[PDB]
Amino acid sequence: FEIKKICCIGAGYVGGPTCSVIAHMCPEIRVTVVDVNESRINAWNSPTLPIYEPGLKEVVESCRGKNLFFSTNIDDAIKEADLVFISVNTPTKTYGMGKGRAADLKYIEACARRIVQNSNGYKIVTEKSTVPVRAAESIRRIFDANTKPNLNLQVLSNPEFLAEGTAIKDLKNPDRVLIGGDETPEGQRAVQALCAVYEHWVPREKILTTNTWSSELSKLAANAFLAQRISSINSISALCEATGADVEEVATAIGMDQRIGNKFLKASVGFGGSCFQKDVLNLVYLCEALNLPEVARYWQQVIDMNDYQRRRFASRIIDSLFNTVTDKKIAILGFAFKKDTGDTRESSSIYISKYLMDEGAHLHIYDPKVPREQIVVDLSHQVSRLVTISKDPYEACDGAHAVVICTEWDMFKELDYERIHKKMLKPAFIFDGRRVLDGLHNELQTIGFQIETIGKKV
Amino acid sequence: FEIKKICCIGAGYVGGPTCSVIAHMCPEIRVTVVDVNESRINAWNSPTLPIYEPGLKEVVESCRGKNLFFSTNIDDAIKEADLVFISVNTPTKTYGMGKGRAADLKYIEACARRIVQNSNGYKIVTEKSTVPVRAAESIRRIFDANTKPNLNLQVLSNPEFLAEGTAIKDLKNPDRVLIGGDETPEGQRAVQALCAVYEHWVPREKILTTNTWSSELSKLAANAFLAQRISSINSISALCEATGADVEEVATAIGMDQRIGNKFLKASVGFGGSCFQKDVLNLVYLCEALNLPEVARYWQQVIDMNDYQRRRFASRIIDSLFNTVTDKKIAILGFAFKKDTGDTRESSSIYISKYLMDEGAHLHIYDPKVPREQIVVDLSHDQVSRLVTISKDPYEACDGAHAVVICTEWDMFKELDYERIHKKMLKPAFIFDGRRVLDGLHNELQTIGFQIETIGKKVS
Amino acid sequence: FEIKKICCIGAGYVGGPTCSVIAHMCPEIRVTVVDVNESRINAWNSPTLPIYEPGLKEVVESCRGKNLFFSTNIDDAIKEADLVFISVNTPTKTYGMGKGRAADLKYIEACARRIVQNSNGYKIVTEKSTVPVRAAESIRRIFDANTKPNLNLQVLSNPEFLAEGTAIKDLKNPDRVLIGGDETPEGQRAVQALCAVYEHWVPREKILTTNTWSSELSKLAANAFLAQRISSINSISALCEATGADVEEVATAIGMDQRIGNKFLKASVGFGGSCFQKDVLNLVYLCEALNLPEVARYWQQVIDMNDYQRRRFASRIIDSLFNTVTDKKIAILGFAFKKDTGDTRESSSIYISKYLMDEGAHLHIYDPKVPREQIVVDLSDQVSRLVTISKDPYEACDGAHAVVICTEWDMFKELDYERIHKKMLKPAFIFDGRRVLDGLHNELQTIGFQIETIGKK
């Protein structure tokens, strides 16, 4: 069996770029991306794509209309497809059992029911989005319970490891392509057919085939391990402040051990983004549901440490300002969860800001990329009375008691702090939650700034 | 400052090989290794060295008598030295505050008092063994309180990262050389003098200079991070058994992410050795002493997960044998904490064996390298005499056994004649692979008739 | 250096009476009291002072216009002052870290910034109001970070120990005057300069000079020790009810030991007022912030015992009325936290009333001095339906099932209880929460009451 027609249900940041790269590297394969938002599909067929990714516009326009297509006729695309990707988002449950930690499979289930209704003959159905472990069994149960004569649907797991901003680079040169299928002979045929698609541009040595459950678990575990590295170095940063050690020196010394590696060992006020906490919490919920409390509380520590790092950093700020910041102007520099993005999901800036707002602080927030409306929404259920969004860092720092750096924007390293210090109220504090002012502490102290930072003793 | 004479106090597993390599790569530096055991010093000056390390004999005999010397005259070696290494072992405290977790600084303190009494002029004193964080502050306090006119002792931290069996390779090609000293100008002079010693064979790019506290903490943190990787994959292995996932597939998929790396992602019945648990526990005690309970309980999970992995594996064995193993013969294959060593310190085999002995099992224990006496001592506080038998070959231990428990990843266990083993085993016959060494044989073993259970794979 | 001009920031019940006595006993020292409340300053300059304190009017009028002045020109008074008193209120924090227990230093910080902006030359700045320990360190940090050439500000702690109603008596004859300053030579000069002011009417032996931290802690510790004595005797009162002992007999026996003393050994439903619980809670929060959980939980017991005494007393009332007081009329006699005042802050009557209101009781509250509006606010739909404020005790007790005495007013001892008993529903109960009816129990029982009281079985 040769895959010639691919349908991806979901034109988001996973289904879009992934199938765009497939059509780019597989000219013979017809790739149709379908979705429910007519605005999205129209945008995908427009000169301005509904998502910005470097190289995506170059990739899409060189394939769109030839073998890459975007449409709203999901039923027709499903019927003709040989391979159906399921790329709908699985949001965290908002209520009920597993609220806040379990994944809500309602979209995947809705997708599976739609697929089985519009499918005849042999097809391969592949989970692309991050799913909870054993979710493919739910898809197979739906397929089994709604079977038709000569209808043979094979379910595979092919989790995506792309990152925002570098999706195209990650898709064209992946660290590994993970494909999971049943150990049965029919499942292995489906696995090889999907492997043959990736083999057009991915070396065979980087294509790892596993069972379905291992593939689903590996996606969760990878993000949990990464978050754990950050929580671990953050735990050391608290110890460094207590001992006189420096977390950057420790991290450099740790990372030179080749068995540990030097990536993801940067201490910070806390990890953010829409993947790390969500995946760890889903891992914790899975363990609790499987009667593995020891494993659950093990991985809960990654989240607990991340929360502790934020609370501790906020408490240092409050304690430094005499345990009272009511009506005190505090400049928050950086609101994105990391530099060079507008994404604020689970940004440590949100939690630091909320803690200071709980104390009645007047926050003046500057971020070069996060739009003004996003900041208000994230801080909103108070925001009108306590939060001001500044146009430039000097506006936020004027008349402020403290400057809190929550995102590692490169521009913050280049601010005219002598100018900032003149208009700040004294004593003037800088709280570097990202270690971006290292090497400037001597100059800042001579200017007259009390500089406090993560993982360095005061 | 030019270091020309080096004295290492402690001729053990750290002080010996490290100073041997220094004299090898620094022919012009006189290196004297001193100790309190006359047998050790005599052994060091003998054709059979008191510790076996590959290439150590070649290194030592090439330098011994030229610029490497072993002696018991600690006072004279201290007086003439420009650099004094402190390589005495810091054992865990047996009683009092921090029992079982805190380090006992009595030897380092005794060494520091010995140094200050026999030292005149400028000297550099360097902690080489694993010390608790802020231990150098205690050495400096002793030096300050016992100061002499024109006596200037500089204290440095230079923790060792050598591994037993490959110390010489690690010393000649280290991943990094860590040197910690005071940020004061005098401390920086001491740091550069020790850096200049390492620069004879270590590139300056791999020599990392920090403050003293960062250097002490980095040694503890590195071992804690490594142990954490093992505990993390072991936690996944429990999940894999619950879900039908396979921990080896997950670990391979995890380790292909370059940010994570593929080292130290082998699921097992639990990590062992004299380093991992000791350092994590010392890290936990340090955090508790510094009013950081959140950090303490964070790192306690690494130990708790490792203990849970052993208990769970033992409980699977007991449950598989009908929750009764009284008088049941069980073959334990492998007793060392890892393959290719005789070291049993904190070996998972010990804890698995103790759990089975708590149930009255008759353990027949085979290890190709661990001597018989060590096994008895580790399992001993009557119970060992009645319940434990040390076999001389694996087939002797498996004859008439209900279960074969593989606790160490010895390569020979992969090559055993299991069909021969299965004939003489009592039925049902179980194999518990606690190291994943029988992967790829599970099909053959099941056809032979072996109920094969292993870490991180659901029971088939 | 001799102090000649004194400015007190805050014209409240601490800054006002204290500086009034200073100007009275130091005619040659110019004393200016400044505040933001224009009404307060105008009231201070009026024949009706903004606060009633016995002997204050004679003291103020004997000095006002000569060397005691009240003004709103804070900047001018600060600049000329040799000694600046900081007497602003430090209320408990309402939100954030330490909500309900930590002190809110925002006013002290605002005052310190105001002082440093308007100050030139040598000055002595003195905390007079109850501050958390280490607060003077924050003032010194502000002064250090906002320094000027030749500007030398010395920070001292001079906590107040006056009590409302007897402030003038306590100021003129203090048990002790406490002054805390840096052990540095410059601090000792500031300490002696303030000591020289107090020495005009305070004997040198009663002026205790300590470091700043000791002075701040002593103020908190003194109130905590006092609260502890009450909680301790209240804990014994629960024991007495369980054993047949009498807490008044035990308290008398305890207090005759000279090492213990006979003061503050009166069992009650619970201590009240704006100082005791506030000081203990601030002490507890201070311990928790300083990683001393053992000390924190030690002093938390004082508050926990005080809460338990109120809850237990309310539970006895409810249990005596068949565990149901819905729509039952209950007369609450006394609402102030102690007799002979209108102050209801942390009054045990509030908490007993709230417990009875939680059970749907119809409370008829009488207090001879607490105004009607204060009672409503303190208990504040529930107050409108369940609470009635009575004009006289007989109105409150008419048709009531129980009479709850929560404040030790002397008039309650002299009520016509036979008249009360006739119109009460039977069985009729009297819950004496202050032991004010001792010696009347035989008469009350013969009348037909079931009299229950603290510390008696």
Author numbering:
A (entry chain A): 2 to 382, 390 to 466
B (entry chain F): 2 to 382, 389 to 467
C (entry chain C): 2 to 381, 389 to 465
The authors write:
Human UDP-glucose dehydrogenase (hUGDH) catalyzes the oxidation of UDP-glucose into UDP-glucuronic acid, an essential substrate in the Phase II metabolism of drugs. hUGDH is a hexamer that exists in an equilibrium between an active (E) state and an inactive (EΩ) state, with the latter being stabilized by the binding of the allosteric inhibitor UDP-xylose (UDP-Xyl). hUGDH forms a hexamer arranged as a trimer of dimers, with each chain containing a NAD+ binding domain (NB domain) and a substrate binding domain (SB domain). The active site is located between the NB and SB domains within each chain, which are both flexible and undergo a rigid-body rotation to open the active site and bind substrate.
Unliganded hUGDH (hUGDH) was purified and used to prepare electron microscopy grids for single particle cryo-EM data collection. Processing, refinement, and image reconstruction produced a 2.06 Å density map which revealed that the major class of unliganded hUGDH is the 32 symmetry E state. Analysis of the particle set with 2D classification shows that the E state represents ∼60% of the particles, with the remaining fraction appearing to represent dimers or monomers, which is consistent with sedimentation velocity data showing that the E state forms a less stable hexamer than the EΩ state. As expected, there is no evidence of a nucleotide sugar in the active sites (not shown). The cryo-EM structure also shows that all the NB domains are rotated 11.8° to the open conformation. The cryo-EM density of the open NB domains is less ordered than the rest of the structure, indicating domain flexibility. This is consistent with the various crystal structures of the E state, which reveal NB domain rotations ranging from 0 to 13°, depending on the unique packing constraints of the different crystal lattices. Here, we show that UX4O shifts the ensemble toward the EΩ state, and that unliganded hUGDH strongly favors the E state.
